[PDB]
Design an enzyme around this catalytic site. Structure first.
Site, PDB file in Angstrom:
ATOM      1  N   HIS A  74     -95.148 -16.819  66.126  1.00  0.00           N
ATOM      2  CA  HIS A  74     -96.154 -16.816  65.055  1.00  0.00           C
ATOM      3  C   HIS A  74     -96.811 -18.168  64.836  1.00  0.00           C
ATOM      4  O   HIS A  74     -96.765 -18.729  63.742  1.00  0.00           O
ATOM      5  CB  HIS A  74     -95.564 -16.288  63.756  1.00  0.00           C
ATOM      6  CG  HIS A  74     -95.196 -14.851  63.836  1.00  0.00           C
ATOM      7  ND1 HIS A  74     -93.905 -14.419  63.999  1.00  0.00           N
ATOM      8  CD2 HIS A  74     -95.965 -13.740  63.814  1.00  0.00           C
ATOM      9  CE1 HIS A  74     -93.884 -13.100  64.031  1.00  0.00           C
ATOM     10  NE2 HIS A  74     -95.125 -12.667  63.935  1.00  0.00           N
ATOM     11  N   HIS A 130    -100.960 -17.093  68.737  1.00  0.00           N
ATOM     12  CA  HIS A 130    -100.898 -15.722  68.352  1.00  0.00           C
ATOM     13  C   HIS A 130    -102.150 -15.263  67.591  1.00  0.00           C
ATOM     14  O   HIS A 130    -102.680 -14.192  67.864  1.00  0.00           O
ATOM     15  CB  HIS A 130     -99.640 -15.462  67.528  1.00  0.00           C
ATOM     16  CG  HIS A 130     -99.613 -14.120  66.885  1.00  0.00           C
ATOM     17  ND1 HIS A 130     -99.568 -12.945  67.605  1.00  0.00           N
ATOM     18  CD2 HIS A 130     -99.652 -13.765  65.583  1.00  0.00           C
ATOM     19  CE1 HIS A 130     -99.541 -11.923  66.773  1.00  0.00           C
ATOM     20  NE2 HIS A 130     -99.589 -12.397  65.544  1.00  0.00           N
ATOM     21  N   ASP A 132    -101.413 -14.711  59.676  1.00  0.00           N
ATOM     22  CA  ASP A 132    -100.027 -15.252  59.660  1.00  0.00           C
ATOM     23  C   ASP A 132     -99.909 -16.733  59.157  1.00  0.00           C
ATOM     24  O   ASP A 132     -98.936 -17.403  59.489  1.00  0.00           O
ATOM     25  CB  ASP A 132     -99.440 -15.160  61.064  1.00  0.00           C
ATOM     26  CG  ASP A 132     -98.990 -13.764  61.423  1.00  0.00           C
ATOM     27  OD1 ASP A 132     -98.365 -13.062  60.599  1.00  0.00           O
ATOM     28  OD2 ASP A 132     -99.274 -13.365  62.556  1.00  0.00           O
TER      29      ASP A 132
END
Ligand SMILES: [Mg+2]
Ligand SMILES: [Zn+2]
Length: 333
Positions: free
Chosen positions: A84, A88, A125
């Site tokens: 993450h 990503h 994220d």
């Protein structure tokens, strides 16, 4: 937050991306990372080109400068974790670009919604620590306690949204500053709805809701648009198995290592470790990928394609093909 400098912007602007077609379904972000010693700058350049190539920011009064500032404000808030990380979210952004333009999902959405989607990929994220929601809740971490007390279990997803809103409050990085009224509201609400929908505890119900809406010719249009945005961001998030095998394998390794680190930290904490997160137990990357394909990814992609998103048939083909290739790994072991 701290302003972006002309030096930071220039470090991205000089990356020329020779040999790469960022709009292509076979695009390889791992190969792009290796291609220079400035992989963070290349990743930002990929995002910047995707957004400019869409033609969208221009249409909503978002200058090249503000766009790039936004990209760099996002990048600052990703961490050095195995999965993450910033690579990503650039991957999710690129993949969503393919779903929209190669998969023709753009036909289902306004230009604003396409714009919000590509932007939301980059925030979805923010500040992930390589730990899942369950870690924070199980360990009674401060954020876990706050989430329990305030009634939401989506610890990370709320946190990501908070940081997105903070980045966008500064007009120098507000990619939505050219919007007013209902459009501005729609951009913020749809971004937030999409991020909250990436919590995998909500996977089954988000899918079912999308499919129910797509099968109903009388569904509320605004609601269908919203669910389509949600399902496309989700699709991007679980799109690793839809890529060329070797790209897929590299992703799977990166996630497997992140999970293993979570399991290591759970051992030190004395809390429960699931088999998936426990180094001491696993031997078989192929069985995990096949399992994920069979129970999560293949049904998801098959159902949304058949329901509605016919242009994304290649995702189903590649999953099929990747699964057959993992079955060959097993057969020859
Ligand atoms: Mg997430
Ligand atoms: Zn994600």
């Amino acid at each position: 937050v701290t302003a972006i400098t002309k030096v930071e912007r220039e470090a991205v602007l000089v990356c020329e991306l020779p040999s790469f077609d960022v709009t292509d379904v076979e695009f390889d972000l791992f190969r792009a990372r290796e291609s220079t010693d400035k992989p963070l700058d290349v990743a930002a350049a990929i995002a910047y080109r995707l957004l400019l190539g869409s033609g969208l920011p221009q249409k909503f009064g978002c200058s090249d400068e503000v766009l790039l500032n936004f990209i760099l404000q996002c990048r600052k808030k990703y961490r050095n974790v195995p999965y993450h990380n910033f690579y990503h979210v650039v991957d999710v952004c690129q993949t969503i670009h393919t779903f929209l333009y190669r998969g023709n999902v753009y036909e289902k959405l306004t230009e604003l919604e396409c714009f919000v989607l590509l932007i939301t990929a980059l925030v979805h994220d923010l500040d992930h620590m390589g730990l899942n929601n369950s870690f924070y809740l199980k360990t009674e971490s401060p954020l876990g306690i706050l989430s329990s007390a305030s009634g939401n279990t989506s610890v990370l997803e709320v946190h990501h949204c908070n940081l997105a809103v903070e980045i966008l409050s500064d007009p120098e990085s507000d990619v939505f500053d050219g919007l007013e009224g209902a459009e501005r509201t729609l951009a913020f609400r749809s971004m937030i709805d999409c991020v909250l929908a990436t919590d995998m505890a909500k996977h089954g119900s988000a899918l079912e809701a999308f499919l129910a809406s797509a099968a109903d010719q009388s569904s509320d249009e605004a609601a269908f648009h919203r669910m389509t945005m949600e399902i496309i961001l989700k699709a991007g998030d679980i799109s690793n198995v839809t890529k060329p095998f070797d790209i897929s394998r590299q992703w799977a390794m990166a996630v497997t290592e992140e999970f293993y680190r979570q399991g290591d930290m759970e051992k030190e904490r004395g809390v429960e470790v699931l088999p998936m997160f426990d180094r001491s137990k696993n031997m078989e990357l192929a069985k995990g990928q096949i399992g994920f394909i069979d129970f999560v990814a293949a049904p998801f992609f098959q159902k949304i394609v058949d329901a509605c998103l016919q242009g994304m048939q290649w995702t189903v083909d590649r999953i099929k093909s990747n699964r057959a290739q993992w079955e060959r790994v097993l057969e020859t072991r």
